[PDB]
Amino acid sequence: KHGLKEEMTMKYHMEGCVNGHKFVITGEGIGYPFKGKQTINLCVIEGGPLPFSEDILSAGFDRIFTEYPQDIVDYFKNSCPAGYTWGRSFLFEDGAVCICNVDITVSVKENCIYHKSIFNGVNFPADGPVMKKMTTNWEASCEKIMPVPKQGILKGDVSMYLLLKDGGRYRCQFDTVYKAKSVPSKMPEWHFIQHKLLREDRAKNQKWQLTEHAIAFPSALA
Amino acid sequence: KHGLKEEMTMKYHMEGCVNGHKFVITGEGIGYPFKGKQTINLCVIEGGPLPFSEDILSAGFDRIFTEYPQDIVDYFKNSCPAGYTWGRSFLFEDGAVCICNVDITVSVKENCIYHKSIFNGVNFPADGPVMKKMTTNWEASCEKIMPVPKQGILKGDVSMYLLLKDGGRYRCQFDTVYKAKSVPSKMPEWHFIQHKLLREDRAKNQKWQLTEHAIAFPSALA
Amino acid sequence: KHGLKEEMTMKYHMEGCVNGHKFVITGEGIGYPFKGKQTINLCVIEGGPLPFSEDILSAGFDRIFTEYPQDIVDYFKNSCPAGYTWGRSFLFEDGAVCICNVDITVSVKENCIYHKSIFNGVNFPADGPVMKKMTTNWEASCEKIMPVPKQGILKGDVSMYLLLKDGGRYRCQFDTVYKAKSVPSKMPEWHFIQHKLLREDRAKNQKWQLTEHAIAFPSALA
Amino acid sequence: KHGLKEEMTMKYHMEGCVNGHKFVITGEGIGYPFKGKQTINLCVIEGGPLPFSEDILSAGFDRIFTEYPQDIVDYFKNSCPAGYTWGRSFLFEDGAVCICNVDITVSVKENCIYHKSIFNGVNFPADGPVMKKMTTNWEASCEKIMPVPKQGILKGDVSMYLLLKDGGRYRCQFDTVYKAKSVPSKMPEWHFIQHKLLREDRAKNQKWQLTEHAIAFPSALA
């Protein structure tokens, strides 16, 4: 109906720079828009091996892949097949900061979703979990999604924790704007989305895999 | 079992200072620990009429009043009847900041819960929603609750929105530590709590009423 | 002329609560308004010994004691003898937060300046420099002072570093509003003030001493 | 001695993306390393006309151009002719965020300094001063420069104000790391630098000019 089928494929290109190191990452994978699941495999083709933990890039590679109850308006699916863009800031508690822009576009012909990313960051401390690769996975999280009705865009807000090998928690504040590639017809009331995101790594060429399950749920409290 | 019954009464004393103005507020109300509901009525007995919106004080007056599924450890109820203390910072987006400390203690004899608060704030702009009283209610929110196992305490984190009469959203970041008044035996895995909080105001003496429904829910994603 | 003489005496009362611990501190000392120097001695009379480093309270006990070139309007001296109030937030990098309100009033009769403070804080980590007393002194700093002409008040902004015994730096963001106790006649262009602040401690009763030198200087760059 | 002469020329290339709009800017100008002055002219060659105020990019195009008293170690000049890189985050008070990386390299042959920049940003509000071009100039500022001795790098910290056409002030927090392109021999004690930065705009092709005067000064307070 909007270009999507219960099972689809995805391609991801990310160009970036962290702490002055450039890199390019390319990724393919499988996803289930209505189940709210993606699984994707990534490969560094430039700048490898990354001197910073791969975890920082994970949310840098798609809300189309969210399970939405039919009662709530799905802005992301509604934007398809042309798709949507978004931008996000990442504010880490040790002062590091990153920013990401992503253009997402559905190719109905090939039943494939494309993701081009620019990812940039700075001020990760040399002696901190990211440049020393002491991060494990991101905790599950619950995101708030708020309409900016006058603008036709959405804002997301979620405070995120990265778990440390050595026990602890490393915080990162995510602030996101989501913009349909053309004017939507309806606009959701605000709502939550719950997320789970896991990484499993893979010595010739740096590679790894990510999985995400996400589910939307109304403001309403029983 | 821990001093609590399905229906209870509450008393609230808050002493504070906002933008240099002091005040004292006293409150009584009714609550349902296991349903996760309180309703409470408040009266200014000093410093009235408040020159700042009453909304800022709302979370300043109890997690005992949260509905907890039996599967997740309820730290707050477990701390009763002696109870617990907590402290919270409030970081508003226009630069204003507030802090609150609260001592909570259950009187099993009288089936009553006492709440003593100190509330302080500064740097609310004269020409902003709080000092001009243009705030409506707080949006529903979803709080994260994280164990600090080594310390026996909990940390809460939730980014909060106050709605404006004139449409918009005014943000406030809440960071909280919760400390049982003596050493707990078990410690919850981390979890979410969903909140709803509403104000209805009441010309002799400044008074108003607050209602809260809150429900805990596990990290797990179906 | 405004109640002040090249040498004066000061009295300081601070009531506070940090991390749930209350206390009262009383202080006397000597100061030189036009040289921009104070030296003051402090004594805990309640809640002693403090479980948190004394450094956090240092800026919590007077801009009257700033050296001002005659070319720039001195708002603080101009507010005397009635004096002025102020409020400040303190945002530490580990998430702790404090707030202070202070009423300052000159007693020309006795050539004495009074300082009443309320100081409150929360969320200092148990295992961090403040609750473990691993702080040394605050680095020198340069504060920005900005007029809010329409309101007749001033805003101060300075990012502050506390030095750690074990080498490092612990950051704290200070945001301040300064309010004359009645309407001033002129209002400064904005400007810098440079600060130096040092602590030397003193087993019967917890006591210590603070010294401050501060000098104002115009926006202008040679 | 380190490749520099009292008068030099500069070339600037910046590639960027703000709020999803890409662009390329190219710039030439004249500078006086030891007087701490640059003046530079800029031209958009891609993406013009910018939909966001030009002010945001101003600090995005060199500390070599700082007047340093001989008593304080000049890390930047010392890094020449090979030069140095740096990265900076920009945290605006309305939630927008930007990041910049810059590689600076001196061509002694041609008495020219090259500046390649990547500049990225997001979450500038549509209805805010930057996307509506209501900004004037940046106020003068005083930056703190702190050595990270173990790493051989420097950290800068300065809270910045952009002035608004319609009167007001728009805040931006700058955090910077400066990294010599090879290991320096000495390391400065920390210090201040005072900055002044002004823009004058110029209908065929979007162009404009920037000027900067900057002067370093020791921690010491007379």
PDB file of N, CA, C and O in Angstrom, chain C residues 139-142 144 146-147 157 159 161 169 171 173 175 190 192 194 196 213-215 217-222, chain D residues 139-142 144 146-147 157 159 161 169 171 173 175 190 192 194 196 213-215 217-222:
ATOM      1  N   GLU C 139      39.895  26.389  40.421  1.00  0.00           N
ATOM      2  CA  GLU C 139      40.668  27.239  39.524  1.00  0.00           C
ATOM      3  C   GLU C 139      40.115  28.621  39.396  1.00  0.00           C
ATOM      4  O   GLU C 139      38.921  28.875  39.522  1.00  0.00           O
ATOM      5  N   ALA C 140      41.011  29.520  39.078  1.00  0.00           N
ATOM      6  CA  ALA C 140      40.653  30.833  38.667  1.00  0.00           C
ATOM      7  C   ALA C 140      39.790  30.730  37.466  1.00  0.00           C
ATOM      8  O   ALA C 140      39.860  29.769  36.684  1.00  0.00           O
ATOM      9  N   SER C 141      39.012  31.769  37.295  1.00  0.00           N
ATOM     10  CA  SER C 141      37.918  31.739  36.379  1.00  0.00           C
ATOM     11  C   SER C 141      37.653  33.151  35.869  1.00  0.00           C
ATOM     12  O   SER C 141      38.076  34.104  36.452  1.00  0.00           O
ATOM     13  N   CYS C 142      36.924  33.270  34.781  1.00  0.00           N
ATOM     14  CA  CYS C 142      36.544  34.575  34.293  1.00  0.00           C
ATOM     15  C   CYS C 142      35.028  34.548  34.023  1.00  0.00           C
ATOM     16  O   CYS C 142      34.538  33.689  33.313  1.00  0.00           O
ATOM     17  N   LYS C 144      31.228  36.028  33.054  1.00  0.00           N
ATOM     18  CA  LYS C 144      30.589  37.046  32.262  1.00  0.00           C
ATOM     19  C   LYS C 144      29.374  37.656  32.981  1.00  0.00           C
ATOM     20  O   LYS C 144      28.538  36.956  33.523  1.00  0.00           O
ATOM     21  N   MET C 146      26.157  40.129  32.392  1.00  0.00           N
ATOM     22  CA  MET C 146      25.252  40.620  31.318  1.00  0.00           C
ATOM     23  C   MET C 146      24.045  41.318  31.950  1.00  0.00           C
ATOM     24  O   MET C 146      23.388  40.712  32.856  1.00  0.00           O
ATOM     25  N   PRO C 147      23.729  42.554  31.476  1.00  0.00           N
ATOM     26  CA  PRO C 147      22.556  43.268  31.922  1.00  0.00           C
ATOM     27  C   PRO C 147      21.297  42.717  31.295  1.00  0.00           C
ATOM     28  O   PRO C 147      21.319  42.366  30.124  1.00  0.00           O
ATOM     29  N   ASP C 157      27.567  34.180  34.295  1.00  0.00           N
ATOM     30  CA  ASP C 157      27.769  32.877  33.661  1.00  0.00           C
ATOM     31  C   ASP C 157      29.263  32.535  33.695  1.00  0.00           C
ATOM     32  O   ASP C 157      30.114  33.276  33.189  1.00  0.00           O
ATOM     33  N   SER C 159      31.967  28.898  33.796  1.00  0.00           N
ATOM     34  CA  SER C 159      32.052  27.474  33.871  1.00  0.00           C
ATOM     35  C   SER C 159      33.246  27.286  34.814  1.00  0.00           C
ATOM     36  O   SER C 159      34.190  27.990  34.685  1.00  0.00           O
ATOM     37  N   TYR C 161      36.099  25.055  37.408  1.00  0.00           N
ATOM     38  CA  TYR C 161      36.791  23.766  37.659  1.00  0.00           C
ATOM     39  C   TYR C 161      37.255  23.616  39.127  1.00  0.00           C
ATOM     40  O   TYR C 161      37.862  24.513  39.707  1.00  0.00           O
ATOM     41  N   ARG C 169      40.411  17.359  37.018  1.00  0.00           N
ATOM     42  CA  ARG C 169      39.567  18.555  37.032  1.00  0.00           C
ATOM     43  C   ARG C 169      38.123  18.115  37.147  1.00  0.00           C
ATOM     44  O   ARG C 169      37.716  17.178  36.492  1.00  0.00           O
ATOM     45  N   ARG C 171      34.300  19.639  36.810  1.00  0.00           N
ATOM     46  CA  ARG C 171      33.576  20.784  36.296  1.00  0.00           C
ATOM     47  C   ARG C 171      32.232  21.094  36.971  1.00  0.00           C
ATOM     48  O   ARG C 171      31.477  20.204  37.348  1.00  0.00           O
ATOM     49  N   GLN C 173      29.015  24.091  36.282  1.00  0.00           N
ATOM     50  CA  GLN C 173      28.505  25.256  35.593  1.00  0.00           C
ATOM     51  C   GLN C 173      27.707  26.134  36.559  1.00  0.00           C
ATOM     52  O   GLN C 173      26.823  25.640  37.237  1.00  0.00           O
ATOM     53  N   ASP C 175      25.300  29.496  37.020  1.00  0.00           N
ATOM     54  CA  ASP C 175      24.398  30.466  36.419  1.00  0.00           C
ATOM     55  C   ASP C 175      23.728  31.223  37.571  1.00  0.00           C
ATOM     56  O   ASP C 175      23.140  30.623  38.527  1.00  0.00           O
ATOM     57  N   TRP C 190      27.781  44.972  29.554  1.00  0.00           N
ATOM     58  CA  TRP C 190      28.300  43.751  30.088  1.00  0.00           C
ATOM     59  C   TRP C 190      29.821  43.722  30.140  1.00  0.00           C
ATOM     60  O   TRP C 190      30.534  44.447  29.453  1.00  0.00           O
ATOM     61  N   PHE C 192      33.437  41.409  32.114  1.00  0.00           N
ATOM     62  CA  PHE C 192      34.054  40.261  32.700  1.00  0.00           C
ATOM     63  C   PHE C 192      34.389  40.564  34.150  1.00  0.00           C
ATOM     64  O   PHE C 192      34.538  41.706  34.546  1.00  0.00           O
ATOM     65  N   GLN C 194      37.278  38.684  36.803  1.00  0.00           N
ATOM     66  CA  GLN C 194      38.206  37.607  37.058  1.00  0.00           C
ATOM     67  C   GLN C 194      38.303  37.312  38.531  1.00  0.00           C
ATOM     68  O   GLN C 194      38.410  38.249  39.344  1.00  0.00           O
ATOM     69  N   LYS C 196      39.747  34.791  41.886  1.00  0.00           N
ATOM     70  CA  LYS C 196      40.546  33.786  42.505  1.00  0.00           C
ATOM     71  C   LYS C 196      40.064  33.498  43.908  1.00  0.00           C
ATOM     72  O   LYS C 196      39.783  34.415  44.700  1.00  0.00           O
ATOM     73  N   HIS C 213      40.014  37.074  45.552  1.00  0.00           N
ATOM     74  CA  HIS C 213      40.342  38.341  44.870  1.00  0.00           C
ATOM     75  C   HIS C 213      39.607  38.335  43.542  1.00  0.00           C
ATOM     76  O   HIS C 213      39.650  37.321  42.811  1.00  0.00           O
ATOM     77  N   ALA C 214      38.915  39.446  43.254  1.00  0.00           N
ATOM     78  CA  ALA C 214      38.139  39.624  42.043  1.00  0.00           C
ATOM     79  C   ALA C 214      38.264  40.999  41.415  1.00  0.00           C
ATOM     80  O   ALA C 214      38.195  42.022  42.100  1.00  0.00           O
ATOM     81  N   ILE C 215      38.392  41.025  40.088  1.00  0.00           N
ATOM     82  CA  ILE C 215      38.620  42.277  39.366  1.00  0.00           C
ATOM     83  C   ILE C 215      37.807  42.310  38.090  1.00  0.00           C
ATOM     84  O   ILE C 215      37.908  41.393  37.279  1.00  0.00           O
ATOM     85  N   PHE C 217      36.549  43.881  34.367  1.00  0.00           N
ATOM     86  CA  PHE C 217      37.262  44.422  33.247  1.00  0.00           C
ATOM     87  C   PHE C 217      36.420  44.446  31.983  1.00  0.00           C
ATOM     88  O   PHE C 217      35.616  43.566  31.734  1.00  0.00           O
ATOM     89  N   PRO C 218      36.544  45.522  31.217  1.00  0.00           N
ATOM     90  CA  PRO C 218      35.594  45.824  30.146  1.00  0.00           C
ATOM     91  C   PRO C 218      35.689  44.868  28.992  1.00  0.00           C
ATOM     92  O   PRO C 218      36.734  44.260  28.778  1.00  0.00           O
ATOM     93  N   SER C 219      34.598  44.780  28.241  1.00  0.00           N
ATOM     94  CA  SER C 219      34.514  43.941  27.048  1.00  0.00           C
ATOM     95  C   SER C 219      35.638  44.242  26.078  1.00  0.00           C
ATOM     96  O   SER C 219      36.012  43.397  25.296  1.00  0.00           O
ATOM     97  N   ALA C 220      36.118  45.480  26.107  1.00  0.00           N
ATOM     98  CA  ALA C 220      36.975  46.031  25.072  1.00  0.00           C
ATOM     99  C   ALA C 220      38.285  45.284  25.017  1.00  0.00           C
ATOM    100  O   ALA C 220      38.825  44.891  26.033  1.00  0.00           O
ATOM    101  N   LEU C 221      38.763  45.092  23.801  1.00  0.00           N
ATOM    102  CA  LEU C 221      39.981  44.373  23.519  1.00  0.00           C
ATOM    103  C   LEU C 221      40.918  45.382  22.893  1.00  0.00           C
ATOM    104  O   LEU C 221      40.578  45.975  21.859  1.00  0.00           O
ATOM    105  N   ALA C 222      42.087  45.596  23.488  1.00  0.00           N
ATOM    106  CA  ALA C 222      43.053  46.550  22.913  1.00  0.00           C
ATOM    107  C   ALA C 222      43.300  46.245  21.437  1.00  0.00           C
ATOM    108  O   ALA C 222      44.187  45.476  21.098  1.00  0.00           O
TER     109      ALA C 222
ATOM    110  N   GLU D 139      28.914  38.067  20.598  1.00  0.00           N
ATOM    111  CA  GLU D 139      29.634  38.824  21.615  1.00  0.00           C
ATOM    112  C   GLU D 139      31.040  38.361  21.812  1.00  0.00           C
ATOM    113  O   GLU D 139      31.393  37.202  21.618  1.00  0.00           O
ATOM    114  N   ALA D 140      31.842  39.290  22.265  1.00  0.00           N
ATOM    115  CA  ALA D 140      33.145  38.993  22.753  1.00  0.00           C
ATOM    116  C   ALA D 140      33.019  38.033  23.874  1.00  0.00           C
ATOM    117  O   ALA D 140      32.000  37.972  24.580  1.00  0.00           O
ATOM    118  N   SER D 141      34.098  37.318  24.069  1.00  0.00           N
ATOM    119  CA  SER D 141      34.085  36.155  24.897  1.00  0.00           C
ATOM    120  C   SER D 141      35.471  35.950  25.497  1.00  0.00           C
ATOM    121  O   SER D 141      36.430  36.485  25.024  1.00  0.00           O
ATOM    122  N   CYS D 142      35.564  35.148  26.533  1.00  0.00           N
ATOM    123  CA  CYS D 142      36.855  34.822  27.094  1.00  0.00           C
ATOM    124  C   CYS D 142      36.924  33.291  27.248  1.00  0.00           C
ATOM    125  O   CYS D 142      36.055  32.687  27.849  1.00  0.00           O
ATOM    126  N   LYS D 144      38.613  29.539  28.048  1.00  0.00           N
ATOM    127  CA  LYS D 144      39.615  28.913  28.869  1.00  0.00           C
ATOM    128  C   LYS D 144      40.368  27.806  28.113  1.00  0.00           C
ATOM    129  O   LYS D 144      39.776  26.968  27.457  1.00  0.00           O
ATOM    130  N   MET D 146      43.028  24.733  28.657  1.00  0.00           N
ATOM    131  CA  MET D 146      43.506  23.783  29.697  1.00  0.00           C
ATOM    132  C   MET D 146      44.339  22.682  29.035  1.00  0.00           C
ATOM    133  O   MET D 146      43.854  22.058  28.038  1.00  0.00           O
ATOM    134  N   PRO D 147      45.557  22.416  29.581  1.00  0.00           N
ATOM    135  CA  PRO D 147      46.390  21.336  29.109  1.00  0.00           C
ATOM    136  C   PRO D 147      45.891  19.995  29.594  1.00  0.00           C
ATOM    137  O   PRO D 147      45.454  19.900  30.732  1.00  0.00           O
ATOM    138  N   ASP D 157      37.147  25.869  26.396  1.00  0.00           N
ATOM    139  CA  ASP D 157      35.789  25.927  26.937  1.00  0.00           C
ATOM    140  C   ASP D 157      35.337  27.391  26.987  1.00  0.00           C
ATOM    141  O   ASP D 157      35.971  28.250  27.612  1.00  0.00           O
ATOM    142  N   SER D 159      31.522  29.832  26.797  1.00  0.00           N
ATOM    143  CA  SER D 159      30.105  29.823  26.615  1.00  0.00           C
ATOM    144  C   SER D 159      29.897  31.072  25.751  1.00  0.00           C
ATOM    145  O   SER D 159      30.516  32.050  26.005  1.00  0.00           O
ATOM    146  N   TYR D 161      27.653  33.959  23.206  1.00  0.00           N
ATOM    147  CA  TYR D 161      26.338  34.576  22.904  1.00  0.00           C
ATOM    148  C   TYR D 161      26.262  35.144  21.468  1.00  0.00           C
ATOM    149  O   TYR D 161      27.150  35.857  21.008  1.00  0.00           O
ATOM    150  N   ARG D 169      19.643  37.674  23.299  1.00  0.00           N
ATOM    151  CA  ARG D 169      20.898  36.920  23.318  1.00  0.00           C
ATOM    152  C   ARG D 169      20.579  35.463  23.062  1.00  0.00           C
ATOM    153  O   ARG D 169      19.630  34.939  23.608  1.00  0.00           O
ATOM    154  N   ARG D 171      22.361  31.741  23.235  1.00  0.00           N
ATOM    155  CA  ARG D 171      23.517  31.061  23.784  1.00  0.00           C
ATOM    156  C   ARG D 171      23.977  29.800  23.038  1.00  0.00           C
ATOM    157  O   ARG D 171      23.178  29.017  22.536  1.00  0.00           O
ATOM    158  N   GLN D 173      27.152  26.758  23.724  1.00  0.00           N
ATOM    159  CA  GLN D 173      28.298  26.277  24.464  1.00  0.00           C
ATOM    160  C   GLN D 173      29.303  25.622  23.514  1.00  0.00           C
ATOM    161  O   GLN D 173      28.929  24.763  22.736  1.00  0.00           O
ATOM    162  N   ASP D 175      32.864  23.502  23.146  1.00  0.00           N
ATOM    163  CA  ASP D 175      33.852  22.626  23.754  1.00  0.00           C
ATOM    164  C   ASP D 175      34.741  22.105  22.619  1.00  0.00           C
ATOM    165  O   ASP D 175      34.261  21.554  21.578  1.00  0.00           O
ATOM    166  N   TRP D 190      47.510  26.462  31.985  1.00  0.00           N
ATOM    167  CA  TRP D 190      46.296  26.935  31.395  1.00  0.00           C
ATOM    168  C   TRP D 190      46.155  28.449  31.453  1.00  0.00           C
ATOM    169  O   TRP D 190      46.771  29.155  32.248  1.00  0.00           O
ATOM    170  N   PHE D 192      43.726  32.040  29.575  1.00  0.00           N
ATOM    171  CA  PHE D 192      42.580  32.619  28.946  1.00  0.00           C
ATOM    172  C   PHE D 192      42.964  33.089  27.554  1.00  0.00           C
ATOM    173  O   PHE D 192      44.118  33.349  27.262  1.00  0.00           O
ATOM    174  N   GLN D 194      41.071  36.041  24.981  1.00  0.00           N
ATOM    175  CA  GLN D 194      39.947  36.909  24.710  1.00  0.00           C
ATOM    176  C   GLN D 194      39.756  37.102  23.229  1.00  0.00           C
ATOM    177  O   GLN D 194      40.740  37.339  22.504  1.00  0.00           O
ATOM    178  N   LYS D 196      37.388  38.628  19.801  1.00  0.00           N
ATOM    179  CA  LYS D 196      36.373  39.400  19.164  1.00  0.00           C
ATOM    180  C   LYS D 196      36.227  39.013  17.711  1.00  0.00           C
ATOM    181  O   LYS D 196      37.220  38.862  16.976  1.00  0.00           O
ATOM    182  N   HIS D 213      39.909  39.346  16.358  1.00  0.00           N
ATOM    183  CA  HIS D 213      41.093  39.707  17.161  1.00  0.00           C
ATOM    184  C   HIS D 213      41.045  38.870  18.427  1.00  0.00           C
ATOM    185  O   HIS D 213      39.979  38.782  19.076  1.00  0.00           O
ATOM    186  N   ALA D 214      42.181  38.236  18.750  1.00  0.00           N
ATOM    187  CA  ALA D 214      42.328  37.381  19.911  1.00  0.00           C
ATOM    188  C   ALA D 214      43.638  37.552  20.654  1.00  0.00           C
ATOM    189  O   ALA D 214      44.711  37.610  20.049  1.00  0.00           O
ATOM    190  N   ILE D 215      43.556  37.576  21.985  1.00  0.00           N
ATOM    191  CA  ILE D 215      44.730  37.832  22.819  1.00  0.00           C
ATOM    192  C   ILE D 215      44.731  36.925  24.030  1.00  0.00           C
ATOM    193  O   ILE D 215      43.751  36.897  24.770  1.00  0.00           O
ATOM    194  N   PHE D 217      46.113  35.488  27.763  1.00  0.00           N
ATOM    195  CA  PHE D 217      46.514  36.146  28.972  1.00  0.00           C
ATOM    196  C   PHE D 217      46.508  35.209  30.168  1.00  0.00           C
ATOM    197  O   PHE D 217      45.676  34.328  30.286  1.00  0.00           O
ATOM    198  N   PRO D 218      47.512  35.347  31.024  1.00  0.00           N
ATOM    199  CA  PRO D 218      47.805  34.338  32.043  1.00  0.00           C
ATOM    200  C   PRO D 218      46.763  34.274  33.121  1.00  0.00           C
ATOM    201  O   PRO D 218      46.063  35.253  33.362  1.00  0.00           O
ATOM    202  N   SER D 219      46.702  33.123  33.780  1.00  0.00           N
ATOM    203  CA  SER D 219      45.786  32.885  34.893  1.00  0.00           C
ATOM    204  C   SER D 219      45.928  33.947  35.964  1.00  0.00           C
ATOM    205  O   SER D 219      45.001  34.197  36.701  1.00  0.00           O
ATOM    206  N   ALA D 220      47.124  34.514  36.069  1.00  0.00           N
ATOM    207  CA  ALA D 220      47.530  35.322  37.206  1.00  0.00           C
ATOM    208  C   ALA D 220      46.684  36.567  37.298  1.00  0.00           C
ATOM    209  O   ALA D 220      46.327  37.158  36.296  1.00  0.00           O
ATOM    210  N   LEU D 221      46.366  36.932  38.527  1.00  0.00           N
ATOM    211  CA  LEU D 221      45.538  38.070  38.839  1.00  0.00           C
ATOM    212  C   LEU D 221      46.423  39.023  39.612  1.00  0.00           C
ATOM    213  O   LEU D 221      46.962  38.644  40.661  1.00  0.00           O
ATOM    214  N   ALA D 222      46.591  40.248  39.124  1.00  0.00           N
ATOM    215  CA  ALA D 222      47.423  41.230  39.843  1.00  0.00           C
ATOM    216  C   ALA D 222      46.991  41.336  41.304  1.00  0.00           C
ATOM    217  O   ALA D 222      46.134  42.137  41.645  1.00  0.00           O
TER     218      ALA D 222
END
